[PDB]
């Protein structure tokens, strides 16, 4: 791998749809350092894309590897994201508590 | 049908290899996960893998020692034991097919189990 992201944080706005005609989901992942930053995270595939929309939930904990992309919008006719697919990428739900 | 292998007596500090290999009917499509069961408590959940193996979910107390994988060829799914502590001691379950949340001991196919003791 030449690009490689990996963040922890937690789970906020999921969503689905369809960027062009790939099936997306998509979620903001805050990491925190002490610094927030709301990273918007896209994991495609059909069945990839419906597995984080149906089983990742608001507020959970996430480690997510993937890769930085950087789709320049601001000009027809999320700027900055991390491309999750496997096998290159992942999304990890960490469970605990009570 | 699920048969779990790769159990055995280890020390402190050490490693396993648990597999799991699986029915057509029980793993196609399936989430697989795995459980565990210490002396005197009730089973708990340790780490599952969605079908595509995009999407794993992990115990608080496991998370960054083991590993889940599977192979969607030889219907296995596999967790990568590393750091084991005598907390660790347990008979250790695969299962498939989650009624509901991952996380959350409701599968409809369990296997028998494997223990795994850590000295």
């Known amino acids: 791998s030449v690009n490689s992201v990996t963040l922890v944080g937690v789970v906020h706005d999921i969503q689905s749809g369809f960027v062009y005609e790939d099936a997306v989901t998509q979620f903001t992942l805050t990491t925190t350092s002490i610094e927030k930053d709301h990273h918007t995270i896209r994991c495609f595939g059909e069945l990839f894309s419906a597995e984080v929309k149906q089983k990742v939930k608001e507020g959970n904990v996430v480690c997510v590897n993937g890769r930085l992309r950087l789709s320049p919008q601001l000009e027809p006719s999320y700027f900055p994201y991390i491309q999750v697919q496997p096998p290159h990428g992942q999304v990890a739900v960490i469970h605990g508590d009570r | 049908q699920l048969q779990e292998s790769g159990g055995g007596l280890v020390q402190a500090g050490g490693s396993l290899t648990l597999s799991c290999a699986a029915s057509?009917?029980?793993?196609?499509?399936?989430?697989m996960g795995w459980f565990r069961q210490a002396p005197g408590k009730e089973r708990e959940f340790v780490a599952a893998?969605?079908?595509?193996?995009?999407?794993?979910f992990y115990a608080d107390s496991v998370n960054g020692r083991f590993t889940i994988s599977r192979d969607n060829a030889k219907r296995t799914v596999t967790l990568q034991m590393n750091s084991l502590k005598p907390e660790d001691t347990a008979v250790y379950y695969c299962?498939?097919?989650?009624?509901?949340?991952?996380?959350?001991?409701?599968?409809?196919?369990w296997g028998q189990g494997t223990q795994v003791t850590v000295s």
């Open positions: 057509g009917r029980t793993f196609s499509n399936n989430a």
């Open positions: 893998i969605s079908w595509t193996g995009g999407l794993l």
């Open positions: 299962a498939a097919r989650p009624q509901g949340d991952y996380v959350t001991a409701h599968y409809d196919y």
